[PDB]
């Protein structure tokens, strides 16, 4: 259960963080696509969304690593 | 029973918190791309929604850390 | 398994409360985007919807904390 | 079962949250397009929310009794 | 066990009845949005769908309450 | 598991009958909004679909109620 | 166990419900985006529904079989 | 568990076979709604598509009925 | 569990083979209706796509029937 | 152990099925909105189909392998 | 345990690697249509995405093969 | 069940890393197709997005590989 837990904590959190950042990057591509003038404002805007999207999965990995010893 | 429980609770909070934040910032990028004129007023508005978005996932992470241990 | 219970109850309340608020604020961000004159009316409208959005998750998390004693 | 009480409340959580979230999202979508009459949709949203919340919360009610 | 059953029976009826009515009222909002005089006919029209929408969940919840007893 | 059986059979029938009928009235609301002359034909057209939409869930509810007795 | 027969009807429930539901949803969309031809598509919906319902109901037959 | 097996095999084939053919008729009406001239050409095309769609679910219920003997 | 295995393997492959092929014909119906001149090329085109689409579910179905004996 | 081989091939089934289903759907919808380059579009799926099937099909090999 | 494990590891990698390239090939079909003069630039773009899309599923197939010993 | 754990953790990360990268390159193809003038700006943009998207699945596999040693 402890072995399974560390697996489940990181594994299901992967899909969160993976598609999480993926959904944001797709948006930034759609942003640059419909206006190429704004590569700079959305880049910073995407570089903001990525950490917070990634934020909770890594903490689920810390919990994962704790359960892993 | 017992580490395993804490794992999914943080893991399920990851998927919640990741896509949760992913959905608002994607929208905020969509706000800026079609109107870059008012990037700042909506910027603060996204920074209001993000905590609230993370609010319930984050509380699910506290209980996760609480049960372990 | 009370810990296991508390885990899924909080985890499931996370996904509810996260995407729940995520959808309204995304709407309000999209709302301010196609009319910024009424940024305040939708802000208030979102500050009304959010408690209602949180209503079941917040009562679902106390049961999570209660089942754990 | 302690586990049981969790899922009844847990499924009502996802239900009641996104359930109410989608109607208010709609009212926000409503206010964006021709909001001359802001008041009529307010009442419409305040009607939909209780019935939407109605079944999850009573499903939450059954959750707490099987628990404590 | 019997309590466990009642949980899934009411729980699936919870998500059912919640999103079920939610999608109907959402539709009614889109209806009222493009016609404000037309608020009266759709009001009654939603009041038709809601009972039928609630019909099976409530009966699924009625059996649910029996399942724990 | 007689309780559990009745639970899963009714619970699974709950989500079916709920969202099934929910989209039909939504369609009728979406139908009436883009033409109010034909509000009557869509009502009866939905009044055909609603029984059929609920037909299989209720018999799944009947078997649900049957295994509990 | 007999537990299966419950989910089998339940799984056929969600199947059979949304199956006809998306079909009827479409039929309303059909008459709205052309109102004169409500009749020719009407039978077409009365054609689609049985075959759509066909597989869920035969899954219900085994469900009743797994029970009795 | 052969009874249990026979149940899910047909049950999963049920949701499959139902939604499979269901999506086919929606397409056929979608053709007729804004092209009513060739109702015969699309009818045969759907009456060809329906068997193949039902083919694997119907074969899955055969296995369902077979393991139950 | 051999009955269960054969059940889920064929049952979940049912959803695969049903909706998988169903989406292919749905496109051809929507395609042929919004241009009826090329009805013949689309006939062979689905008769090409369908085998490959069913190819992987059906070979998974062979595995389904052997494990049950 | 029999149960395992079932899901491995089964999950590879839904993977490989819907995977090519989305691409072939794309190629016909592509051909519908330009019929001159039907030949260029034929090859792309005959490229896409193997790679789409590649990982599901190797998952069925392991499926029979885990069964020995 | 190990046979069961290896099964889901490849199975989950199956849906990933299959649908992964599927979304990429789907994108290229819409891309190649307008225009095919730039088919070569887009072909290379797809031949980049395909490995990376398959990257995590294929290593998960190695773990499936890894569990074999 | 340690063997089981390593399987799902890498397996669940597979769907994450696959669909995660898949949606990004699909988006980038949609960007370049509507104007290839800026092939280079999006080239770097996907080469930025892909690592962060791939980031958590890969750390989920190291965690997966860690339970396996």
From Swiss-Prot, chains D, G, J:
Organism from which the protein derives: Alkalihalophilus pseudofirmus (strain ATCC BAA-2126 / JCM 17055 / OF4)
Role description: F(1)F(0) ATP synthase produces ATP from ADP in the presence of a proton or sodium gradient. F-type ATPases consist of two structural domains, F(1) containing the extramembraneous catalytic core and F(0) containing the membrane proton channel, linked together by a central stalk and a peripheral stalk. During catalysis, ATP synthesis in the catalytic domain of F(1) is coupled via a rotary mechanism of the central stalk subunits to proton translocation.
Source lineage: Bacteria, Bacillati, Bacillota, Bacilli, Bacillales
Gene: atpE
Residues passing through the membrane, by range: 4-24, 46-66
Site label Reversibly protonated during proton transport, positions: 53
A Pfam family per the record: ATP-synt_C
Location of this chain's protein in the cell: Cell membrane
HAMAP family: ATP_synth_c_bact
Chief location: membrane
UniProt keywords, alphabetically: ATP synthesis, Cell membrane, CF(0), Hydrogen ion transport, Ion transport, Lipid-binding, Membrane, Transmembrane, Transmembrane helix, Transport
SUPFAM superfamilies xrefs: F1F0 ATP synthase subunit C
Subunit structure: F-type ATPases have 2 components, F(1) - the catalytic core - and F(0) - the membrane proton channel. F(1) has five subunits: alpha(3), beta(3), gamma(1), delta(1), epsilon(1). F(0) has three main subunits: a(1), b(2) and c(10-14). The alpha and beta chains form an alternating ring which encloses part of the gamma chain. F(1) is attached to F(0) by a central stalk formed by the gamma and epsilon chains, while a peripheral stalk is formed by the delta and b chains.
Entry membrane topology: Multi-pass membrane protein
GO cellular component, one term: proton-transporting ATP synthase complex
The UniProt record lists the keyword Metal-binding: no
UniProt GO molecular function: lipid binding; proton-transporting ATP synthase activity, rotational mechanism
Transport in keyword set: yes
Name used for this protein in its record: ATP synthase subunit c
Homology family: Belongs to the ATPase C chain family.
């Amino acid at each position: 259960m402890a072995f399974l837990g560390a697996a489940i904590a990181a594994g299901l959190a992967a899909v969160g963080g993976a598609i999480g950042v993926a959904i944001i990057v797709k948006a930034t591509i759609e942003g640059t696509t419909r206006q190429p003038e704004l590569r700079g404002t959305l880049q910073t805007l995407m570089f903001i969304g990525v950490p917070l999207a990634e934020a909770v999965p890594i903490i689920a990995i810390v919990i994962s690593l704790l359960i892993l010893f």
